[PDB]
């Protein structure tokens, strides 16, 4: 299972959650930004590691990060 | 006509003209002073 971490520079634009192809991410309420929103990653046992979320984040530097880690059946994307 | 003057200054055309003129200049120099290995003047 890969690791996905959210950092407090997040502006809560939700662009990363819209992009995930396996539904790893989620929005949760917060108080540190104008959107009162922050991303979370509750379901990292399904993450294929495509970094489609990182291409979508606009902050500099990134607010979502994907660290590739130990591989499994779901992580490798095997249908057999 | 002004648009043509602008277009003629776009990068590929400008470089094309610049280098064609430079080529003519070096070609004519070498046609006048052929086979130069040194500066034979001073």
């Amino acid at each position: 299972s890969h690791s996905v971490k959210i950092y407090d520079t997040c502006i809560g634009c939700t662009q990363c959650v819209r992009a995930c192809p396996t539904d790893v991410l989620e929005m949760i309420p917060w108080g540190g930004c104008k959107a009162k929103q922050i991303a979370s990653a509750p379901r990292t046992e399904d993450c294929v590691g495509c970094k489609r979320c990182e291409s979508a984040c606009p902050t500099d530097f990134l607010s979502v990060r994907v660290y590739l880690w130990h591989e499994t059946t779901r992580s490798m994307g095997l249908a057999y | 006509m002004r648009d043509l003057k602008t277009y003629l200054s776009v990068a590929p055309v400008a470089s094309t003209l610049w280098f064609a003129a430079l080529a003519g200049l070096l070609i004519e120099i070498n046609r006048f002073f052929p086979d130069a290995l040194t500066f034979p003047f001073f």
Binding site: C13, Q15, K34, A56, P58 | -
Partner: protein, 97 residues
Amino acid sequence: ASYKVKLVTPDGTQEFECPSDVYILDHAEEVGIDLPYSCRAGSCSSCAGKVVGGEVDQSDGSFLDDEQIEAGFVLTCVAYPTSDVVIETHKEEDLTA
């Protein structure tokens, strides 16, 4: 130049003056009619809105459908108001569908 802007909003409809070389959002920032934004960079849908009249410069707009700029929606933070416009605010989800 500095055409008058009109923004329907749950707070009401207010006008402010502001030159054409500017983005709408910082100009509603000037006079102080609060609007919703997240990015300020044209890469999300929080500053979304649609138009009542005229049309707004969307040259430096991105992350939009090859249509979102031909059937009404606009991002307020990357938009130049070429005319005396009349626009909508808080328009993300009926854009989000």
